[PDB]
Amino acid sequence: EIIEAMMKTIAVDEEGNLDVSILEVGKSSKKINKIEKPEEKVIEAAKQAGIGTKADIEKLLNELKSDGRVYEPRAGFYRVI
Amino acid sequence: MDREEMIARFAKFLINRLKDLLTVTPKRSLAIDWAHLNSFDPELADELLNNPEEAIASAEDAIQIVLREPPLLVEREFKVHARFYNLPKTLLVKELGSEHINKLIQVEGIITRVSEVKPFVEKAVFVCRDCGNEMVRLQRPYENLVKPAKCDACGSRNIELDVDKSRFLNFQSFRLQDRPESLKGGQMPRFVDAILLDDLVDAALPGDRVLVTGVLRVILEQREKRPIFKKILEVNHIEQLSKEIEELEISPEDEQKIRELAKRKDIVDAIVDSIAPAIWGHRIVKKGIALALFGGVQRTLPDGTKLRGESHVLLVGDPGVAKSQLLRYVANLAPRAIYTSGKSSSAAGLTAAAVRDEFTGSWVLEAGVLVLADGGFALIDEFDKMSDRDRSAIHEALEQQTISISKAGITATLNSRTTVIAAANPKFGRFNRHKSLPEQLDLPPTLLSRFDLIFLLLDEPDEKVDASIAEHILKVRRGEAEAVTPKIPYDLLKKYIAYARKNVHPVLSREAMEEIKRYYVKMRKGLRRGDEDGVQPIPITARQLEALIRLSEAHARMRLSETVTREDARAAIEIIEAMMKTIAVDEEGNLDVSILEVGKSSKKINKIEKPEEKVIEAAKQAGIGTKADIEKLLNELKSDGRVYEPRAGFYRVI
Ligand SMILES: Nc1ncnc2c1ncn2[C@@H]1O[C@H](COP(=O)(O)OP(=O)(O)OP(=O)(O)O)[C@@H](O)[C@H]1O
Ligand SMILES: [Mg+2]
């Protein structure tokens, strides 16, 4: 009951993935990063794809800019490494 | 103390060694035995053990006398360095302490650091502008340079170094450390640095087990502490360890019980169940690790080449599969194994490297796990996390089992004859069944072709396997008997593996060769032309054939048989087939372990795919791939440079 209440009060995921270890939800978070793997073009490409909202895909590519998977080639450009 | 008496006693004791020294002209060193001295005069041995400074010089003068006055006198009084290569007690680096300074000791260990040859000055002749040029100072090789405060002849202070009259000799500096794999229960890596001289210079390589025996000296550092600071072993004689000191020890009844266990039925199943009984399942992984432990026979053809006899295993899996534990139990079960991690804090974790030292800033070569474990195992956890320097030499330390490093003026061809039972993790976080193996692994594609066994420790949410592993975990936590008691005890299994790797050298048989040929020709031409003509999916290669031969010779050694029978070849073939099935390398078994792309669905599509919207529409109407297929194709081309974007909505090729 304590473990059941712990996973509920944290709300790790909508399906129960162990997000305490892998921060990615996995159900609809890690998969989207593989679909993502120009800046004005990839937002329009993700809009018709529906993998994530505008605010969501903005953080998906920016978080990848930290590790370096998705870099910014030029002004308004976004290409994977 | 009675120096003349010591010289007379040494002359009366000293003759076969002197005869052998007089026979060969260029040889100058003389190897004196301590057992001969004990059989002749134990008082001289006690005097040598008391004060080695007045003992080596007196013995040297005495052997020079016995070389001069008796016949066969050499024209020149060349330096005859007394090299005592025996002592009643063989100390260790961990046992060594300050109570052995200024006494002839015999410490054993393994060399980890090595310096270059330097011309150190022995008798520094000090020159001055005024008189007082004959002044000399007998400096020490381990100590630093000393300068006189004033010349006693005339009171002048214009001192200088006369490099013309100074006698320079060879000097080397190494670091003797405790054998980590041979001695790991103590967990004491304390070590003592040592110096080598004109005769002992360039005697051993880093990672070799040597038995050095010299006078433990000491050097003063500064005035920060009143007593001495650091001790430096002045090596008098160096010699490599024998073939029993650096290996396990066995008894006659131990050999008898090992033979009896070998005669026991289902020995292979017992060995597999005896490897890490705590972790449930992974029977194929345990069998592969066992086959890696009983490594194949290492043969050297007369043409000069050396055939490989080490089966490397890579355990790729998602976190939480107890892969790390697998690397802990085998670390203590294997005879010679150094359990390490990928995130190594040392400057040379696995590959040797030339780094600056602290004594004089001189470049010294320091070895790593892949060198100190010569003739053993190296369980490298988190193999995906390696520095860029180590990712360029592991390609040679596996195939050529050697490390040729020449940076910083330190040329050395080390021998990395280690079995790498490693375990890597996917860079994405979890392995995907719909993608290839090197596409999610941080290791380069060429590196994956080295490991003879690549097991996928992928977890699956199946009700049966989850219930089984939960029951096993509850049993191992409750303290159940048969859950932690293997069929073979750990010490006996370790001695068994040692005996098999030392005395059992199986040879191939015509039946096993016929079976291997049949399997190879069955695998070859395995629908290779299918869906790929330019790059037909290759099901197997000669490398993997050599790996299968090594695994077949591993199953014959596991049961202590000198002939690789048909059963061993069939077991190796079954293991290879299970690995190829659980890997899912390609649709038709293409060897993506070298290119990291299947020739049917990845490499073919890439060539027929290499604007953005216009080109994806053209691909869609021509039939190269669907929407997601062309999206992944354009992403791959962007990453490679073939869809780089100069403008918005543009995927031109460079
Ligand atoms: N078959 C099994 N039998 C017993 N325990 C298991 C089994 N599979 C997983 N475990 C448990 O999973 C836990 C984690 O394992 P461990 O940390 O040793 O390796 P790992 O989890 O694979 O490492 P990583 O998560 O970094 O891949 C351990 O406590 C272990 O007991
Ligand atoms: Mg771990």
Side-chain angles (χ1 to χ4, degrees), chain A residues 1-12 14-22 25-26 28-36 38-40 42-43 45-46 48-53 55 57 59 61-62 66 68 71 73-77 79-81, chain B residues 1-3 6-11 15 17-18 21-24 26 28-40 42-45 48-52 54-60 62-68 70-72 74 78 80-128 131-143 145-159 161-163 165-174 176-180 182-187 189-222 227-406 408-459 461-527 530 533-585 587-595 598-608 611-612 615-616 618-619 621-626 628 630 632 634-635 638-639 641 644 646 648-650 652-654:
Chain A
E1 187 177 359
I2 295 300
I3 295 296
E4 281 270 12
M6 176 194 64
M7 296 181 178
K8 182 179 180 180
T9 191
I10 297 182
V12 292
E14 300 86 7
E15 293 288 75
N17 187 359
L18 70 168
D19 288 294
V20 310
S21 177
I22 297 312
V25 193
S28 44
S29 80
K30 183 189 295 294
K31 318 293 289 297
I32 299 315
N33 312 317
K34 315 183 132 193
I35 313 303
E36 200 87 350
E39 174 87 9
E40 309 323 299
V42 304
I43 303 312
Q48 51 85 14
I51 54 185
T53 68
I57 64 190
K59 312 309 140 194
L61 61 89
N62 196 0
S66 315
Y71 64 95
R74 282 164 295 270
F77 286 92
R79 300 200 302 274
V80 287
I81 203 178
Chain B
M1 300 180 181
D2 53 277
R3 180 181 180 90
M6 293 181 179
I7 291 181
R9 289 182 59 179
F10 262 109
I15 205 177
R17 306 295 179 176
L18 190 60
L21 163 73
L22 287 174
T23 45
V24 52
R28 47 183 172 182
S29 279
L30 183 62
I32 310 178
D33 194 9
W34 197 275
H36 303 170
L37 184 51
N38 289 341
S39 84
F40 199 92
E43 185 56 86
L44 201 52
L48 260 61
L49 272 182
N50 283 327
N51 215 57
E54 68 177 4
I56 303 179
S58 45
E60 182 165 356
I63 64 183
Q64 270 282 353
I65 288 179
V66 187
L67 185 136
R68 182 62 57 180
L72 309 96
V74 176
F78 70 107
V80 285
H81 294 73
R83 257 50 177 150
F84 302 98
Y85 61 98
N86 189 266
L87 269 188
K89 179 58 187 302
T90 301
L91 283 84
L92 284 82
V93 191
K94 54 164 58 181
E95 195 178 357
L96 194 49
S98 280
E99 57 271 3
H100 300 291
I101 311 183
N102 205 32
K103 285 192 299 297
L104 195 59
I105 61 181
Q106 188 180 31
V107 56
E108 64 184 16
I110 184 176
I111 302 181
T112 60
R113 296 179 176 267
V114 56
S115 87
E116 308 107 342
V117 192
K118 294 307 192 174
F120 87 99
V121 54
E122 182 182 12
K123 196 178 306 304
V125 195
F126 284 104
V127 70
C128 319
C131 86
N133 315 337
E134 197 95 0
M135 57 180 296
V136 287
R137 161 57 58 181
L138 186 65
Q139 300 186 186
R140 296 93 187 263
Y142 44 87
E143 285 190 358
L145 194 84
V146 293
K147 280 296 181 178
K150 196 201 65 175
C151 167
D152 203 281
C154 51
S156 315
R157 211 158 286 101
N158 42 17
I159 59 173
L161 181 59
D162 192 271
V163 299
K165 205 180 173 183
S166 315
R167 34 185 295 179
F168 305 91
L169 269 73
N170 293 315
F171 151 76
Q172 202 175 31
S173 199
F174 72 100
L176 191 78
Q177 292 194 1
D178 277 310
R179 295 163 289 179
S182 315
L183 287 92
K184 201 169 295 301
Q187 298 287 343
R190 52 244 52 263
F191 69 99
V192 177
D193 298 356
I195 57 178
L196 301 168
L197 291 174
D198 60 290
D199 282 326
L200 307 182
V201 63
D202 270 329
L205 273 301
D208 191 12
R209 277 84 171 184
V210 296
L211 179 59
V212 295
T213 167
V215 195
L216 187 56
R217 293 302 183 181
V218 62
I219 173 176
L220 186 68
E221 179 181 358
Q222 211 256 332
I228 46 180
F229 290 80
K230 194 170 185 172
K231 51 174 181 178
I232 291 184
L233 174 68
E234 186 262 332
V235 180
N236 173 265
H237 178 97
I238 184 176
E239 182 183 11
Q240 298 183 358
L241 278 180
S242 86
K243 292 306 294 175
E244 56 95 11
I245 295 178
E246 60 175 356
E247 280 86 9
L248 273 72
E249 307 282 349
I250 50 181
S251 87
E253 54 93 13
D254 191 19
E255 299 176 352
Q256 178 65 31
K257 78 199 309 179
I258 285 308
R259 280 275 192 260
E260 292 308 307
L261 177 69
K263 295 179 180 60
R264 172 194 170 186
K265 203 59 179 59
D266 56 87
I267 176 63
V268 172
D269 304 70
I271 291 181
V272 166
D273 298 359
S274 309
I275 292 188
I279 170 170
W280 179 91
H282 304 249
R283 264 200 57 89
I284 304 302
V285 182
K286 290 173 180 179
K287 198 171 306 176
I289 291 181
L291 288 174
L293 289 174
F294 301 98
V297 55
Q298 296 84 10
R299 315 190 189 194
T300 43
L301 299 178
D303 313 328
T305 180
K306 298 182 180 180
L307 302 177
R308 209 179 91 175
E310 292 83 10
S311 300
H312 312 271
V313 183
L314 183 64
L315 281 79
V316 180
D318 291 0
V321 301
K323 64 173 66 66
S324 304
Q325 292 178 337
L326 296 169
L327 295 186
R328 303 187 176 94
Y329 290 108
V330 186
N332 53 82
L333 182 57
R336 177 176 299 182
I338 304 177
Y339 177 66
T340 179
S341 306
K343 278 293 194 300
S344 45
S345 57
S346 158
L350 320 170
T351 295
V355 79
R356 296 286 207 177
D357 72 327
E358 70 271 23
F359 291 97
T360 175
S362 186
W363 297 98
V364 287
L365 172 65
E366 181 190 2
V369 180
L370 293 187
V371 184
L372 305 186
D374 193 287
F377 306 90
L379 287 86
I380 311 170
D381 195 7
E382 303 177 3
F383 199 75
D384 52 348
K385 308 170 185 178
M386 294 176 305
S387 81
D388 289 325
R389 184 194 72 258
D390 299 332
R391 289 179 179 270
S392 315
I394 52 181
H395 293 55
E396 191 181 8
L398 274 59
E399 288 183 341
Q400 295 72 16
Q401 309 287 341
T402 186
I403 299 183
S404 285
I405 173 166
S406 57
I410 315 177
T411 58
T413 315
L414 301 188
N415 299 120
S416 196
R417 300 167 298 183
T418 72
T419 294
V420 181
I421 307 180
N425 302 119
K427 57 181 179 181
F428 295 150
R430 286 191 299 182
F431 184 79
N432 197 327
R433 204 66 177 183
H434 300 257
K435 296 186 61 179
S436 161
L437 175 61
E439 298 177 356
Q440 314 181 49
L441 204 61
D442 215 342
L443 308 183
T446 318
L447 181 60
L448 269 75
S449 306
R450 313 284 193 269
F451 300 95
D452 300 336
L453 286 171
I454 304 178
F455 301 103
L456 274 190
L457 272 71
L458 183 62
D459 65 279
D462 183 88
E463 299 183 359
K464 299 180 62 60
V465 72
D466 276 288
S468 315
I469 193 179
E471 198 261 358
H472 191 99
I473 287 184
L474 280 165
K475 284 199 306 180
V476 74
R477 188 56 187 268
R478 185 188 183 182
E480 200 276 333
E482 70 100 18
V484 175
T485 47
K487 297 183 179 181
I488 305 173
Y490 292 101
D491 194 12
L492 195 148
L493 190 53
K494 190 169 181 287
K495 296 162 173 299
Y496 183 90
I497 296 178
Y499 181 82
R501 294 175 59 89
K502 183 187 304 178
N503 296 112
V504 180
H505 300 284
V507 298
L508 299 173
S509 189
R510 187 46 64 178
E511 297 86 13
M513 293 164 73
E514 174 202 349
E515 174 80 12
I516 289 180
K517 281 173 52 182
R518 169 162 54 250
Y519 172 69
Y520 186 79
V521 302
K522 177 196 304 175
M523 186 63 58
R524 286 309 298 265
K525 192 181 295 305
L527 299 183
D533 190 2
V535 283
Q536 300 188 359
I538 299 299
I540 205 179
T541 308
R543 301 196 197 181
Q544 296 194 347
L545 185 62
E546 300 175 357
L548 178 70
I549 294 173
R550 282 191 297 266
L551 290 184
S552 316
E553 289 178 339
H555 199 281
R557 179 177 290 181
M558 185 157 49
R559 67 154 181 261
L560 271 66
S561 88
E562 298 289 334
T563 316
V564 181
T565 60
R566 184 96 67 175
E567 315 298 326
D568 309 317
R570 285 176 177 174
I573 285 161
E574 182 179 358
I575 289 301
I576 289 296
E577 282 275 2
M579 175 191 62
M580 293 302 177
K581 175 251 180 181
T582 192
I583 278 184
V585 63
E587 285 279 348
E588 277 311 286
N590 181 33
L591 286 203
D592 305 2
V593 297
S594 44
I595 305 105
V598 53
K600 170 192 287 189
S601 158
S602 160
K603 189 173 179 179
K604 268 313 197 296
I605 298 314
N606 264 307
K607 214 151 81 193
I608 55 186
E612 185 175 0
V615 310
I616 56 184
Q621 58 82 13
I624 300 90
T626 62
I630 66 186
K632 308 325 294 173
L634 68 87
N635 289 329
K638 279 184 172 185
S639 46
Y644 90 105
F650 205 69
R652 199 150 52 190
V653 56
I654 194 182

Coordinates of all heavy atoms in Angstrom, one line a residue, chain B residues 333-383:
Chain B
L333 N 35.0 -15.3 -9.3 CA 35.1 -16.7 -9.7 C 36.2 -17.0 -10.7 O 36.8 -18.1 -10.7 CB 33.7 -17.1 -10.4 CG 33.6 -18.6 -10.8 CD1 33.8 -19.5 -9.6 CD2 32.2 -18.8 -11.4
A334 N 36.5 -16.0 -11.6 CA 37.6 -16.2 -12.5 C 38.9 -16.2 -11.8 O 39.1 -15.5 -10.8 CB 37.6 -15.0 -13.6
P335 N 39.9 -17.0 -12.3 CA 41.2 -17.0 -11.7 C 41.9 -15.7 -11.7 O 42.4 -15.2 -10.6 CB 42.0 -18.1 -12.5 CG 41.3 -18.1 -13.8 CD 39.8 -17.8 -13.5
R336 N 42.1 -15.0 -12.8 CA 42.8 -13.8 -13.0 C 41.8 -12.8 -13.6 O 41.7 -12.8 -14.8 CB 44.1 -13.9 -13.8 CG 44.8 -12.6 -14.0 CD 46.1 -12.8 -14.7 NE 47.0 -13.7 -13.9 CZ 48.3 -14.0 -14.3 NH1 48.8 -13.6 -15.4 NH2 49.0 -14.8 -13.5
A337 N 41.2 -11.9 -12.8 CA 40.2 -11.0 -13.3 C 40.3 -9.7 -12.5 O 40.5 -9.7 -11.3 CB 38.8 -11.6 -13.2
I338 N 40.2 -8.6 -13.2 CA 40.2 -7.2 -12.6 C 38.9 -6.6 -13.0 O 38.7 -6.1 -14.1 CB 41.4 -6.4 -13.1 CG1 42.7 -7.1 -12.9 CG2 41.4 -5.0 -12.5 CD1 43.9 -6.4 -13.4
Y339 N 38.0 -6.5 -12.0 CA 36.7 -5.9 -12.2 C 36.9 -4.4 -12.2 O 37.3 -3.8 -11.2 CB 35.7 -6.3 -11.1 CG 34.4 -5.6 -11.2 CD1 33.5 -5.8 -12.3 CD2 33.9 -4.7 -10.2 CE1 32.3 -5.2 -12.4 CE2 32.7 -4.1 -10.3 CZ 31.9 -4.3 -11.4 OH 30.7 -3.7 -11.5
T340 N 36.5 -3.7 -13.3 CA 36.6 -2.3 -13.4 C 35.3 -1.7 -14.0 O 34.4 -2.5 -14.3 CB 37.8 -1.9 -14.3 OG1 37.9 -0.5 -14.4 CG2 37.7 -2.5 -15.6
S341 N 35.3 -0.4 -14.2 CA 34.2 0.3 -14.8 C 34.6 1.2 -15.9 O 35.8 1.5 -16.0 CB 33.4 1.1 -13.7 OG 33.1 0.4 -12.6
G342 N 33.7 1.5 -16.8 CA 34.0 2.4 -17.9 C 34.4 3.8 -17.5 O 35.4 4.4 -18.0
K343 N 33.8 4.4 -16.5 CA 34.1 5.7 -16.0 C 35.3 5.5 -15.0 O 35.1 5.5 -13.8 CB 32.9 6.3 -15.3 CG 31.9 7.0 -16.2 CD 32.6 8.2 -16.9 CE 31.5 9.1 -17.5 NZ 30.8 8.4 -18.6
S344 N 36.5 5.4 -15.6 CA 37.7 5.2 -14.8 C 38.3 6.5 -14.4 O 38.5 7.3 -15.3 CB 38.7 4.3 -15.6 OG 38.8 4.7 -16.9
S345 N 38.5 6.8 -13.1 CA 39.1 8.0 -12.7 C 40.6 8.1 -13.0 O 41.1 9.2 -13.1 CB 38.9 8.2 -11.2 OG 39.4 7.1 -10.5
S346 N 41.2 7.0 -13.2 CA 42.7 7.0 -13.5 C 42.9 7.6 -14.9 O 42.0 7.6 -15.8 CB 43.3 5.6 -13.4 OG 44.5 5.5 -14.1
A347 N 44.2 8.0 -15.1 CA 44.5 8.6 -16.4 C 44.6 7.5 -17.5 O 44.3 7.8 -18.6 CB 45.9 9.3 -16.3
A348 N 44.9 6.3 -17.1 CA 45.0 5.1 -18.0 C 44.1 4.0 -17.4 O 44.6 3.2 -16.7 CB 46.4 4.7 -18.3
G349 N 42.8 4.0 -17.7 CA 41.9 3.0 -17.1 C 42.2 1.7 -17.8 O 42.5 0.7 -17.1
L350 N 42.0 1.6 -19.1 CA 42.2 0.3 -19.8 C 43.5 0.4 -20.7 O 44.3 -0.5 -20.6 CB 41.0 0.0 -20.6 CG 39.6 0.2 -19.9 CD1 38.5 0.1 -20.9 CD2 39.5 -0.7 -18.7
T351 N 43.5 1.4 -21.6 CA 44.7 1.5 -22.5 C 45.8 2.3 -21.8 O 45.6 3.2 -21.1 CB 44.3 2.2 -23.8 OG1 43.3 1.4 -24.5 CG2 45.5 2.5 -24.6
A352 N 47.0 1.8 -22.0 CA 48.2 2.4 -21.4 C 48.4 3.8 -22.0 O 48.0 4.1 -23.2 CB 49.5 1.6 -21.7
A353 N 49.0 4.7 -21.3 CA 49.2 6.1 -21.7 C 50.4 6.7 -21.1 O 50.8 6.3 -20.0 CB 47.9 6.9 -21.3
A354 N 51.0 7.6 -21.8 CA 52.2 8.3 -21.4 C 51.8 9.6 -20.7 O 51.3 10.5 -21.4 CB 53.2 8.5 -22.5
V355 N 52.0 9.7 -19.4 CA 51.6 10.9 -18.6 C 52.8 11.4 -17.9 O 53.8 10.7 -17.6 CB 50.4 10.6 -17.7 CG1 50.9 9.9 -16.5 CG2 49.7 11.9 -17.4
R356 N 52.7 12.7 -17.5 CA 53.8 13.3 -16.7 C 53.8 12.7 -15.2 O 52.7 12.5 -14.7 CB 53.7 14.8 -16.7 CG 53.9 15.4 -18.0 CD 55.3 15.4 -18.5 NE 55.6 16.5 -19.4 CZ 56.8 16.8 -19.9 NH1 57.8 16.0 -19.6 NH2 57.0 17.8 -20.7
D357 N 54.9 12.6 -14.6 CA 55.0 12.1 -13.3 C 55.2 13.3 -12.3 O 55.2 14.4 -12.7 CB 56.1 11.1 -13.1 CG 57.5 11.7 -13.2 OD1 57.7 12.7 -13.9 OD2 58.4 11.2 -12.6
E358 N 55.4 13.0 -11.0 CA 55.5 14.0 -10.0 C 57.0 14.2 -9.6 O 57.3 15.3 -8.9 CB 54.7 13.7 -8.8 CG 55.2 12.5 -8.0 CD 54.6 11.2 -8.5 OE1 54.2 11.1 -9.7 OE2 54.5 10.2 -7.7
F359 N 57.9 13.3 -9.8 CA 59.3 13.4 -9.4 C 60.0 14.5 -10.1 O 60.5 15.4 -9.5 CB 60.0 12.1 -9.5 CG 59.5 11.0 -8.5 CD1 58.6 10.1 -8.9 CD2 59.9 11.0 -7.2 CE1 58.1 9.1 -8.1 CE2 59.5 10.0 -6.3 CZ 58.5 9.1 -6.8
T360 N 60.1 14.4 -11.5 CA 60.8 15.3 -12.3 C 60.0 15.8 -13.5 O 60.6 16.3 -14.4 CB 62.2 14.8 -12.7 OG1 62.8 15.7 -13.6 CG2 62.0 13.4 -13.4
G361 N 58.7 15.5 -13.6 CA 58.0 15.9 -14.7 C 58.3 15.1 -16.0 O 58.0 15.6 -17.1
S362 N 58.9 13.9 -15.9 CA 59.3 13.1 -17.0 C 58.2 12.2 -17.4 O 57.4 11.7 -16.6 CB 60.5 12.3 -16.7 OG 61.0 11.6 -17.8
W363 N 58.0 12.1 -18.8 CA 57.0 11.2 -19.3 C 57.2 9.8 -18.9 O 58.2 9.2 -19.2 CB 56.9 11.4 -20.8 CG 56.6 12.7 -21.3 CD1 57.5 13.7 -21.7 CD2 55.3 13.3 -21.4 NE1 56.8 14.8 -22.1 CE2 55.5 14.6 -21.9 CE3 54.0 12.9 -21.1 CZ2 54.4 15.5 -22.1 CZ3 52.9 13.7 -21.3 CH2 53.1 15.0 -21.8
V364 N 56.2 9.2 -18.2 CA 56.2 7.8 -17.8 C 55.0 7.1 -18.4 O 53.9 7.7 -18.5 CB 56.2 7.6 -16.3 CG1 57.6 8.0 -15.7 CG2 55.1 8.5 -15.6
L365 N 55.2 5.9 -18.9 CA 54.1 5.1 -19.4 C 53.5 4.3 -18.3 O 54.1 3.6 -17.6 CB 54.6 4.1 -20.5 CG 53.6 3.1 -21.0 CD1 52.4 3.8 -21.7 CD2 54.3 2.1 -22.0
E366 N 52.1 4.5 -18.1 CA 51.4 3.8 -17.1 C 50.3 2.9 -17.8 O 49.7 3.3 -18.8 CB 50.7 4.8 -16.2 CG 49.8 4.1 -15.1 CD 49.0 5.1 -14.4 OE1 49.0 6.3 -14.7 OE2 48.3 4.7 -13.4
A367 N 50.2 1.7 -17.3 CA 49.3 0.7 -17.9 C 47.9 0.8 -17.3 O 47.7 1.5 -16.3 CB 49.9 -0.7 -17.7
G368 N 47.0 0.0 -17.8 CA 45.6 -0.1 -17.3 C 45.1 -1.5 -17.0 O 45.9 -2.4 -16.8
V369 N 43.8 -1.6 -17.0 CA 43.2 -2.9 -16.7 C 43.6 -3.9 -17.8 O 43.8 -5.1 -17.6 CB 41.7 -2.8 -16.5 CG1 41.1 -4.2 -16.2 CG2 41.4 -1.8 -15.3
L370 N 43.6 -3.5 -19.1 CA 43.9 -4.4 -20.2 C 45.3 -4.8 -20.3 O 45.7 -5.5 -21.2 CB 43.4 -3.7 -21.5 CG 41.9 -3.5 -21.7 CD1 41.6 -3.0 -23.1 CD2 41.1 -4.8 -21.4
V371 N 46.2 -4.3 -19.4 CA 47.6 -4.7 -19.4 C 48.0 -5.4 -18.1 O 48.7 -6.4 -18.1 CB 48.5 -3.5 -19.6 CG1 49.9 -3.9 -19.6 CG2 48.1 -2.7 -20.8
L372 N 47.5 -5.0 -16.9 CA 47.8 -5.6 -15.7 C 47.1 -7.0 -15.6 O 47.5 -7.8 -14.7 CB 47.3 -4.8 -14.5 CG 47.9 -3.3 -14.4 CD1 47.4 -2.6 -13.1 CD2 49.4 -3.3 -14.6
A373 N 46.1 -7.3 -16.4 CA 45.4 -8.6 -16.4 C 45.9 -9.5 -17.5 O 45.2 -10.3 -18.1 CB 43.9 -8.3 -16.6
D374 N 47.2 -9.4 -17.8 CA 47.8 -10.3 -18.8 C 47.6 -11.8 -18.5 O 47.9 -12.2 -17.4 CB 49.3 -10.0 -19.0 CG 49.9 -10.6 -20.2 OD1 50.1 -11.8 -20.3 OD2 50.2 -9.8 -21.2
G375 N 47.2 -12.5 -19.5 CA 46.8 -13.9 -19.3 C 45.7 -14.2 -18.4 O 45.5 -15.2 -17.8
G376 N 44.8 -13.2 -18.3 CA 43.6 -13.3 -17.4 C 42.3 -12.7 -18.0 O 42.1 -12.8 -19.2
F377 N 41.5 -12.1 -17.2 CA 40.2 -11.5 -17.6 C 40.2 -10.1 -17.2 O 40.9 -9.6 -16.2 CB 39.0 -12.3 -17.0 CG 39.1 -13.8 -17.3 CD1 39.7 -14.7 -16.4 CD2 38.5 -14.3 -18.4 CE1 39.7 -16.0 -16.7 CE2 38.5 -15.6 -18.7 CZ 39.1 -16.5 -17.8
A378 N 39.3 -9.3 -17.8 CA 39.1 -7.9 -17.6 C 37.6 -7.6 -17.7 O 37.1 -7.3 -18.8 CB 39.9 -7.0 -18.5
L379 N 36.9 -7.7 -16.6 CA 35.4 -7.4 -16.6 C 35.2 -5.9 -16.5 O 35.2 -5.3 -15.5 CB 34.8 -8.2 -15.5 CG 34.6 -9.7 -15.6 CD1 35.9 -10.4 -15.1 CD2 33.4 -10.2 -14.9
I380 N 35.1 -5.3 -17.7 CA 34.9 -3.9 -17.8 C 33.4 -3.5 -17.8 O 32.8 -3.7 -18.8 CB 35.6 -3.3 -19.0 CG1 37.1 -3.9 -19.1 CG2 35.7 -1.8 -19.0 CD1 37.7 -3.6 -20.4
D381 N 32.9 -3.1 -16.7 CA 31.5 -2.6 -16.6 C 31.3 -1.3 -17.3 O 32.3 -0.4 -17.3 CB 31.1 -2.6 -15.2 CG 29.5 -2.5 -15.0 OD1 28.9 -2.6 -16.1 OD2 29.1 -2.3 -13.9
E382 N 30.2 -1.1 -17.9 CA 29.8 0.2 -18.6 C 30.8 0.4 -19.7 O 31.5 1.5 -19.7 CB 29.7 1.3 -17.6 CG 28.7 1.2 -16.5 CD 28.7 2.3 -15.5 OE1 29.4 3.3 -15.7 OE2 28.0 2.2 -14.5
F383 N 30.9 -0.5 -20.6 CA 31.9 -0.4 -21.7 C 31.6 0.7 -22.7 O 32.5 1.1 -23.4 CB 32.0 -1.8 -22.4 CG 33.2 -2.0 -23.2 CD1 34.5 -2.2 -22.6 CD2 33.2 -1.9 -24.6 CE1 35.6 -2.4 -23.4 CE2 34.4 -2.0 -25.4 CZ 35.6 -2.3 -24.7

